[PDB]
Symmetry: D2
Subunit: 405 residues, 4 copies
């Protein structure tokens, strides 16, 4: 049974992932320093032009609020090893030694608090900047733990930590009891996420978007751990100007719904410009997804997976809250007329197995249309006529609320 902080985590549902660092100035992806075999001295000169001139934490927080996100995961230090906060003497490779001369993480947590969002800190554990990483790993771990200690002690209550990189050394001892134990001492309520069972103090495991089945919550009678999937809008996480291979807004909506189906949270990622602006492309996705999440509000946060399956050949699924069940229905088409056929005009029976209580009424959330339905209570079959979209709309994942008698 989940600890309160993890229950609260699962109620967040949707977070925004923000990638911003020195890489952002080159606009060819966040891994550029390594994958393009850049000269380290020349790449790290980018600290000198890191102005943060267009970074507005209140605009980030406002974007999150508008898209229906409840937490934000910001890259505090990526593999490039540059810190977006005041490391208080630990490293000169930080934003206090850049022209920005602002603790951006402090601006970030203040903006989050004003919008009632949880601030999460991403921290790369695989570091390309410190020579310690390759030639004195135990000392690197001390450096890493100290960089996290700063975040635990100088910014008030933090929502969580998102660690990424332990996979670079699958068989090393990362001394996680001491790292996570330090976090638990100063930040007892923080959610700990490791992007890979790795330590008892982890609260959340990450999974690929395509995972088809309800996620695993840990061994029976051990600590419940939550899950989270991630999606980026094109192929890269940092900004990438000539990556045109953007996903459909429809795919992003389906992926958000899919997360809730398998009992995970989801992060939708955006890459800021060099100077910290939200690109216009990201705003388009946010506005579209935002329309969906506003409509889905009654179920997106509290809704949980339930042992109810859909009929053969259909990708529909069900989510449960303590007051209601919700049918999440896909592959609908638009309704035209007798004379103008768009595909959604015929009766469209969609069935579910595992609904055992008599229903009084079912309605679409988007327009409160009442659906017809039939029930076989002995076999727990619900069949609804899932009407198509009114002409001029298309929600991609449409949601019907069940009111039980």
């Amino acid at each position: 049974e989940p600890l309160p902080r993890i229950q609260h985590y699962e109620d967040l549902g949707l977070g925004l992932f923000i990638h911003w660092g020195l890489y952002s100035q080159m606009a060819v992806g966040e891994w550029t320093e390594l994958i393009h075999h850049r000269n380290q001295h020349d790449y790290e000169q980018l600290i000198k032009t890191f102005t943060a001139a267009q970074f507005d934490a209140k605009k980030i927080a406002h974007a999150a609020k508008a898209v229906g996100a409840k937490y934000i995961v910001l890259t505090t230090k990526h593999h490039e090893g540059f810190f977006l906060y005041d490391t208080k003497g630990l490293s000169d490779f930080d934003v206090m030694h850049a022209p920005a001369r602002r603790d951006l993480i402090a601006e970030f947590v203040a903006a989050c608090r004003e919008e009632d969002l949880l601030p999460f800190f991403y921290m790369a554990t695989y570091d390309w900047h410190t020579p310690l990483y390759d030639d004195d790993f135990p000392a690197y771990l001390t450096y890493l733990q100290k960089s996290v200690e700063v975040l635990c002690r100088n910014y008030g209550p933090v929502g969580g930590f998102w660690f990424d990189g332990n996979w670079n050394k699958k068989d090393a001892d990362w001394h996680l009891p001491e790292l996570y134990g330090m976090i638990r001492h100063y930040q007892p309520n923080a959610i700990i996420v490791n992007n890979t069972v790795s330590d008892p103090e982890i609260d959340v495991v990450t999974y690929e978007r395509r995972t088809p089945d309800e996620i695993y919550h840990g061994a029976p009678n051990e600590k419940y751990v939550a899950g989270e999937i991630s999606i980026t809008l094109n192929q890269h996480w940092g900004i990438a100007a000539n990556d045109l291979n953007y996903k459909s807004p429809a795919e992003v909506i389906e992926t958000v719904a899919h997360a809730r189906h398998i009992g995970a949270n989801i992060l939708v990622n955006i890459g800021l410009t060099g100077t910290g602006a939200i690109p216009a492309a990201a705003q388009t996705y946010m506005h579209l997804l935002g329309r969906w999440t506003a409509m889905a509000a009654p179920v997106l946060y509290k809704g949980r997976p339930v042992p109810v399956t859909s009929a053969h050949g259909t990708r529909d699924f069900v989510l449960h809250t303590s007051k209601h069940d919700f049918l999440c229905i896909l592959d609908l088409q638009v309704v035209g007329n007798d004379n103008v056929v768009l595909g959604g005009e015929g009766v469209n029976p969609r069935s579910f197995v595992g609904i055992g209580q008599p229903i009084q009424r079912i309605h679409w959330l988007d327009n409160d249309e009442v659906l017809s339905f039939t029930q076989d209570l002995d076999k727990k079959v619900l069949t609804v006529d899932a009407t198509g979209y009114p002409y001029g709309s298309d929600w991609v994942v449409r949601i019907a609320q069940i009111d039980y008698e």
Copy 2:
């Protein structure tokens, strides 16, 4: 062999489709009056709030220029039957009787001319506003022909006409020789498109489904050559539709543009303006992404034509021909990482083509001028190239290699 005006049409490659009318104020699609069974009197009151307050023809023309489009097709009158121009006494249901009180078509053609774009006029032939349509069809045809005559005589030279609606009455006599003959009299070089072998000899262009798989038909050997055109809209509707979130991937839009050129057709990419005539922010995102692709593809996008060269089994690659070069259009590439970071594109990736019989000197990607390795079997006309993956930080969706022949 195509008439000059049709050759010029086929060189345009890409156009913008703009849907704007009274429907735009309701933001639930262009067919709303019919499909939502609206009260006609109440729907037509929307003329009273048709302000055109945010319509800027120069911004439309600039958007076209930036995306690589060379013509624009604007809805002058849709099925709702409201005219965006001065009908000069033919109808009171026009923009001169709206608060806009501006001839929007005149603003449109002037903006097109200053950016060197061809203005095209969409005109619905199936009309829901005039009672003539159902009660006196021969008189309706006179009304329709007159509405087109105005466009033929008051706006200077027009690029073309895009007619839509004859399919509402498959078996009627639409008197096309008189309608198209009047156009030919006042606008001899206009391209005529009918969205419907050919339904009149004066038609220059037939429309096709985007998914049409093979090179389009141009007419029988002793007959007039007719061109082709496909269309894509970014979501499910053509007019603006606020709760239509079912937008296509930008990647699909790029592929569809490339596909059009493969089958020897032009393509229209459609945008639906807001009630007041603004380009919505969502459309701008697609235009910027497509615009990056079309700028990179410029050496072949306009002049490139289909050729009898096929690609190997299991591949969607294809070839386009210019008088100077051939171009390999290659899909489903992945990004190149390293030995240690595998993203999918790092191995040698031989892609083959059948029908290249001349020796090649050099082949290079046009996005970054990388030279490709290749082998040839000139007897069987096989070209095989190592189509390298994208450098990390980029992904063009359809990547194009230029062939330089010996």
Copy 3:
């Protein structure tokens, strides 16, 4: 509007067997071998001298049709090679009476068909590679062709039909079909006439042929025009004549599904077998016949009389409905086998399958294979039927399973 009685009777046949047998069969490399392998004509036609027909038993062919549930047989009386499997009575020396067989095989064939109550159909190639008339005297070739058909119309009793193939070799020629089909109508007024081409080719045509993949109910003609039926064909591998090194055989399951599909679109279906050079049914064909035969015996209540009806299945499903005057039938695909709670094979959970277009209250629904009663719910206003389509009992798998609806 309503089909001529002979065409109604044709549509009730449902399933026929197509039988390819000729001189080509002796070489076992496909029926088009003479042309496609560029064979020397003199040497190829020598095969008449070894055409013994020593293992041909028309009763065994008829029995194979009977046991697979077929109600007619289409036998190749003369294929493109131009060799006749019957006594042409002086028209040609290139016939079975001038082979060592010295027997009229078509006479054996129709007597066997009659004893099993099957309709004998005669396949006749109109594109002929033997007679010089085809290339040097087309008008006389037509006379030769018409005469070869006349013999079939006058010496073998009542014939079920004719299956013509080859007019596509000369798309623009005058084939004198009014005279050919008019002669058939004179001697065999009830014969079904089928013309295989790539608007029908003549008013006397009764049946058009179509691709197996045809997705929708076939077209029968406008209401004031003659109703024409349809037929699809399938062969077990890639060739129609026997082909020893063609290993590219279809799954028996696909054959079953294709037969079901035919009925769904309102067509008959021919399943083809290629005999050996001596006229035997090869053992591979027998395997398919026995499996399909199990299916067709179970499907008998609907296979013959069942017709398409405007009832669709739910999203995601390939199920369909067939109508008879007494019942409707749900034809359900993609079911799995039921194990139990502990042994999971895929079919054990409740499996709602829905249909749109059933307006009348139902009393009972049952699987034909084992008479199990299915549970169902109905919304009569929207014409929805939803049934719990249980999986196969362990040890069976019908591929297309069929439930009978008994209406109130």
Copy 4:
């Protein structure tokens, strides 16, 4: 790291026949019928009284295996029903010596195998529905199981291997495999040991895998014992005979699955279910005759061919197999060649490419008809491209194989 000799020899067998025959065969509704149909045990086990084996001829089985190209046979010596097809010498009365057959069928089987140079393998179910020991005294069951295996290890001469199936019924129990497999190694040191799981002990030689396994199989960690792999296919949905299972796979799928096995570096078993009295049913003979044509043509590579780090071009399912003398291109999705006038699909030039061939080639030819193929090479990038011509009219091999002769 290197395979033990017996396991190398196992990997050279390539194809084996799996034979399901037991009391279940008399009901023809699948091999699990006694449990899944909730049969009364007394009534089901009465089938011992009609187990005549009147149509079982081991020499015909062995001859059929030889003709299909198989080099070993895996015969069900006892399935879950717990009935033994051999003389258990007092261990159980529920065996073939107490049936009217009154012949040790396993002895006939091994003698037949030896005279056709096939390896006899014994399938043995470890999950047993007959003995009350299984549920009531598991340690004593394990002794019974090990004793039934001792008999097979001592009374039939050299055995090719053992194929165990059922440990998955008790995932968490101690099956005492060191003692069972140690006794096998004592009497039958050369036997292949296969355990069907879903590496359970150091003595296992072979792991079983799903047919759809996409990539070269895992052989164990680099300094550890090399273990081979094996996939299985049955012709319909059941392993024992099942008269109203009409859901048979295409012969073409069976051919492709055999080729796939070799691609991923596994053997494959093709299964048949005998009739109640032990005959090969007519449907199984059809599949064996078709597969047999393919395996005879594929002989030069089916046994000795191994996976190699060579990939095929995008969108193609083609692959390469290596022997010490040759490489072989296995090419799928071909069509038949007609003429200028008659188009069947295969007539155009059909370039199929491979990455990882680094040595210059002299000649490439189809095995089925010795036609020479045209090819081009880029030796620096290790690209081979061939024009894979279509089938001559009248033939279609499903997986066509070209032999490469190196300079």
